[PDB]
Amino acid sequence: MQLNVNGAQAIEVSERTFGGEFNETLVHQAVVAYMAGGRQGSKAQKTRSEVSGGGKKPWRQKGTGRARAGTIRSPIWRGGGTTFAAKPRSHEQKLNKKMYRAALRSILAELVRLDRLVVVADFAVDAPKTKGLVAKLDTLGLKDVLIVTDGVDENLYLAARNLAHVDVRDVQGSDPVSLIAYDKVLVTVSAVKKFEELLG
Amino acid sequence: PKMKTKSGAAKRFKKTAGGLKHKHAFKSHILTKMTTKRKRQLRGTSMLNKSDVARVERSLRLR
Amino acid sequence: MQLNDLRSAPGARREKHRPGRGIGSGLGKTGGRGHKGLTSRSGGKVAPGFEGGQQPLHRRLPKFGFVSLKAMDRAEVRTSELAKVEGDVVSLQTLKDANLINQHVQRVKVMLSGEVGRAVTLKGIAATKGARAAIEAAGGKFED
Amino acid sequence: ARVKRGVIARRRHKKILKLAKGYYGARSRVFRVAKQAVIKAGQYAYRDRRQRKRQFRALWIARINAGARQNGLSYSRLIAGLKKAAIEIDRKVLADLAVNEKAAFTAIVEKAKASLA
RNA sequence: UGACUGCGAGACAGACACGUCGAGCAGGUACGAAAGUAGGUCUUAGUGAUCCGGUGGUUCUGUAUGGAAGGGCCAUCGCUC
RNA sequence: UAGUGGCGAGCGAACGGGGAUUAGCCCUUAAGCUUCAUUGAUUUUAGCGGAACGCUCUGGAAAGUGCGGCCAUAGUGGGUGAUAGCCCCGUACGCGAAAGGAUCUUUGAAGUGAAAUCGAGUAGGACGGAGCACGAGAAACUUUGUCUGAACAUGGGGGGACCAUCCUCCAAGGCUAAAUACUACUGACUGACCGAUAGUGAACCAGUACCGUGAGGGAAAGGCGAAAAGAACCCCGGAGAGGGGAGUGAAAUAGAACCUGAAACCGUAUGCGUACAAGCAGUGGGAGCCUACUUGUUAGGUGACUGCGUACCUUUUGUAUAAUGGGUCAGCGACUUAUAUUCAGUGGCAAGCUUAACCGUAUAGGGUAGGCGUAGCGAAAGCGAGUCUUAAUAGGGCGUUU
Ligand SMILES: [Mg+2]
Ligand SMILES: [Mg+2]
Ligand SMILES: [Mg+2]
Ligand SMILES: [Mg+2]
Ligand SMILES: [Mg+2]
Ligand SMILES: [Mg+2]
Ligand SMILES: [Mg+2]
Ligand SMILES: [Mg+2]
Ligand SMILES: [Mg+2]
Ligand SMILES: [Mg+2]
Ligand SMILES: [Mg+2]
Ligand SMILES: [Mg+2]
Ligand SMILES: [Mg+2]
Ligand SMILES: [Mg+2]
Ligand SMILES: [Mg+2]
Ligand SMILES: [Mg+2]
Ligand SMILES: [Mg+2]
Ligand SMILES: [Mg+2]
Ligand SMILES: [Mg+2]
Ligand SMILES: [Mg+2]
Ligand SMILES: [Mg+2]
Ligand SMILES: [Mg+2]
Ligand SMILES: [Mg+2]
Ligand SMILES: [Mg+2]
Ligand SMILES: [Mg+2]
Ligand SMILES: [Mg+2]
Ligand SMILES: [Mg+2]
Ligand SMILES: [Mg+2]
Ligand SMILES: [Mg+2]
Ligand SMILES: [Mg+2]
Ligand SMILES: [Mg+2]
């Protein structure tokens, strides 16, 4: 199909990548898999075994009139173990390589259909100045934007670091979540072609 | 950890396309008193009965 | 497409059962375990193969056969798989390069299953009568 | 991750106790006593929707019996007469006439008496 | 010497494991002149799974190779278990 | 999986393959390692600088409202009288060591490795054990408590009983980094971790109080306010306790047992009911009275009198049961998680599908070793859309038309 470029004329892109249908359930799975892959998973509680003390039987089994107790660290007791105490566990799901690519194709096709994809011939800043990038993005009329370049420039990375709603990513770094979250996805022509090789 | 197949079940039930084969009982050591027809029809393999498949399928770790 | 506008398909995801969470859930007060017995107990599980103390089926029946150690190095390649090899010569190493047999396989036999797409040479590989006819029909040949 | 039950549990218990308003002693103050009283009152209320229809009909029939016997008829003979002469005035309205509109009730009884013989 | 060898359509019975009946086909017989009959006994009890070990066969396997051992397969023996 | 196993419950390889690391040196005496010099590199133990905001409204207080700016290699940090990129401390970034520690290095010196000089009470064997996944098994191999006991490369060990042939190695002398394990300790960063009955037993002067002869066991207990501005003074009272004013404060029913301030439980006030009346205490009907406006087809409170009506849980054939459990309230308290797996649903790809470890300016991409599938039958050799049984190409079993 045809992808319009702000600077130059429209270019021809792959239908498989930029014009496929939107698989919402697959895009949902990739987004859920991506968010599960970012969890630290670092917590724990203590079971009855791991709480301090509690070796001795608090009173004899029969005769005292109390309910029978084996330990003062029963999860029934205040200050006892957590019945099913958590341990550090991993939350990352497996996503098939082709499942991930198909979700990326759905996201890219939907971004074009929603006019949220901006294609420019190139995007480079001269000095690592945030003020310079703000001026460049204001000419394009972009405020909340994900900038995708074939190779992340060192000056471009520094200029966008403190910007509130601006993110600069390599093609490999363009996850499904960032392609959906940001209001616009400004992409260079070089990154569009690099997208085509990966997903087509 | 990974499931451990019951060793004894695997030695008595072969998995083929079509079920689990097994030999027959009562062919071991008291055979003079048995008719030839009975001993000949108790020879060879056989497919597992419908009611025993799930139980044996669980003894082997195929379920 | 929005992060607060994404769903899985109906039936893709479901809630898990939560037993013992009141009358209305349908799983309250026993968790679907019934009233008493071993199966209702915490940790109450019946061992696989256990028939209640009756002689189990995995012990009523006799052990039979032996496993073939000689058959652990063999593989069967279908005639439909011969066209997926590279270099017009089907061999032991060329079948491993095509990922059609495992690395440990030391002897291969071809049997008639599918159509031989292109003429190929079978070098050191056995074949059935039907497979041999099909391979030579497509223009192939055999080498010792 | 960790979920405290205090706010939700308090809302549950307060709904029950608010329904137990006016009950005696612990039935209006103590949750696990008030809970039983609110359930039992609900069982009664469901059963007394049925019983109310029976109770009112028995009251209408008794008043119709008293009103018709003042006019020389028993209840059973008046109902049979009100079927012979096709009068479909029901017992709720008939019992209201027998008390509040006695001349109207007398006319109906005479219409039933004529129909019988 | 049919108290045969391979089987076996189809059934009965039955939780399973077991169990029962069996026309017919092939091989090889016995009796009868022959059609035929015979896969034990008028029928229904006389019995014991697996494991393990033993004996007779076997074109199977044989831890470098050839053998062998050992294992498998078929037949069969050892429980008032 | 092979195997092992009262062949029960269980135990459980290796070959081969993919990776991480990579290194070999000597007994005609080395690679290394240690120590002491020594040449340079870093690094650590204090620190320094570090941008850019005003007016206005509400307000006790502005960081919040509205308007208009500026910095950003510094914008989701912590505070400041409510929510701050620009108020403070910081942050990105750039500098910094008199002195000590440490790590890499360049040379040098000894020391060691070092057993000397190629391995004899050794290999092998018998008995009894142990280990090898292998429980005596047909039991190789390692090891040794007892007892024995070689050969010398024309020799010896192993290849899972054992023999022959072949292949492969050279034991009875040594040293050797990396990839690997762990964290009491120090620092930074982080969390779909907790937030005072949680989280450490311990947020608080906690391994304390307390209990125990002792080993040992083992608590409870956080919050005024922005700021003590913590209430001068007067009055009652015992020169009390505690209050009433005054004052402070935005707020004192924020007054120090102090944020909020629930429930059980205990009171005071008002309204109605209640001393001829029998029981799960309600529910249906229902008069009167009281209150409030909407002034009677209304709302609220009470409720005479009357129909019906023996709590709940559990467990049971069956419970008002005189069977069980609960004095009440508040808080806590029980189907989880990991790894293998089957079925279903819903997706990706499709005669293919998928990777594991691992690599990877790292959720991408690579890695296709492996697993499942595309062929079955047979105990198996094997044959193969067939195969097994069998004398049988006959019957029959399983398989093949997806
Ligand atoms: Mg705790
Ligand atoms: Mg990957
Ligand atoms: Mg046998
Ligand atoms: Mg139900
Ligand atoms: Mg129970
Ligand atoms: Mg029972
Ligand atoms: Mg039961
Ligand atoms: Mg492969
Ligand atoms: Mg051999
Ligand atoms: Mg044998
Ligand atoms: Mg500053
Ligand atoms: Mg405040
Ligand atoms: Mg030596
Ligand atoms: Mg020895
Ligand atoms: Mg030796
Ligand atoms: Mg050998
Ligand atoms: Mg050595
Ligand atoms: Mg605590
Ligand atoms: Mg609190
Ligand atoms: Mg004031
Ligand atoms: Mg406060
Ligand atoms: Mg307070
Ligand atoms: Mg009275
Ligand atoms: Mg009384
Ligand atoms: Mg009413
Ligand atoms: Mg009654
Ligand atoms: Mg009873
Ligand atoms: Mg009853
Ligand atoms: Mg009771
Ligand atoms: Mg009683
Ligand atoms: Mg009690």
Coordinates of N, CA and C in Angstrom, one line a residue, chain A residues 17 41 63 97 102 107 110 116 126 154 162 169 175 196:
Chain A
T17 N 2.4 -6.2 6.4 CA 2.8 -5.4 7.6 C 1.8 -4.3 7.9
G41 N 8.5 -9.5 40.5 CA 8.1 -10.8 41.2 C 8.8 -11.0 42.5
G63 N -7.9 -31.9 78.1 CA -8.1 -31.6 79.5 C -8.2 -30.1 79.8
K97 N 7.3 -16.5 18.6 CA 7.9 -15.5 17.8 C 6.9 -14.9 16.7
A102 N 2.9 -11.2 14.6 CA 1.5 -10.9 14.1 C 0.8 -9.8 14.9
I107 N -0.9 -4.1 15.1 CA -0.7 -2.8 15.7 C -0.3 -1.8 14.7
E110 N -3.2 -1.0 12.3 CA -4.2 -0.2 13.0 C -3.7 1.2 13.2
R116 N -2.6 7.6 13.4 CA -1.7 7.8 14.5 C -0.2 7.5 14.1
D126 N 20.6 18.3 15.9 CA 22.1 18.6 15.8 C 22.8 18.5 17.1
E154 N 22.7 9.4 19.3 CA 23.2 9.7 20.7 C 22.6 11.1 21.1
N162 N 14.5 14.1 28.9 CA 13.7 14.8 29.9 C 12.3 15.2 29.4
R169 N 12.9 5.3 20.4 CA 13.2 3.8 20.4 C 13.8 3.4 19.1
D175 N 8.1 -2.0 21.4 CA 7.3 -3.0 22.0 C 5.8 -2.7 21.6
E196 N 9.6 -3.5 7.8 CA 9.2 -4.4 6.7 C 10.0 -5.7 6.6

